Amino acid sequence: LNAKVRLLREELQLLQEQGSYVGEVVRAMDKKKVLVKVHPEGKFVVDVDKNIDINDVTPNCRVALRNDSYTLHKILPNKVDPLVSLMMVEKVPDSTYEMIGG
């Protein structure tokens, strides 16, 4: 219980921030800045924090950002592509051999 409250005083000052954004990595550059495209705002070339995640430099991974310059946070484990999303929205009827059968 003591641990929970100890943690708690620090969190309030930590949380004070300019927000976050979610983008995806198109490509990384060799110099360790990554070209990522934030989905609602523009594309940015900006660096990674290596205290949290080194997988954020890997291309074609949807990535979290924590704003303070649009700095990369970690890669989000939930990804999507438009091709899968096409199948999903329609909810196409799927049917077995019997229906056609006869």
């Binding site: 198109v26 800045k33 523009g42 940015f44 070339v45 310059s69």
Partner: protein, 165 residues
Amino acid sequence: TQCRLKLLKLERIKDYLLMEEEFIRNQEQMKPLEEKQEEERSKVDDLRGTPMSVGTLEEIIDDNHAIVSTSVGSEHYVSILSFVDKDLLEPGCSVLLNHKVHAVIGVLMDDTDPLVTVMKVEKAPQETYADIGGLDNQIQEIKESVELPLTHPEYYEEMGIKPPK
């Protein structure tokens, strides 16, 4: 054969040698590139900051400016600043700009569009020449246009005729 090999080894060495000799020796020297040059590069990184606003170079104009449309949905009039060369850049490339004051820091980005990918469909035939039956000659006349200037352009240029297309 021997003269060609030595020439190639030298050419490769000269680009390397010269570039390098001036730099390190000027670091010893008390007035030329020395500290300044190493610093100049550091100085581009600090000035640009993070983030960097991306742009595409439509054209460079010879007046110390270029037209780069920034990724923000408005156009910008950039100046050759933050140590950059106007003529060095070739049209259609994506460029990196310092947001704080509009300057092209440099070129490395393309940011690849899907339109080029659709166009480039590489070859790998089902059947191909020399597994096709009869009328061998009929293929050979086609080669005159397509194949033969690719295989040997030499015959065509020496003859001096318009290259068949």
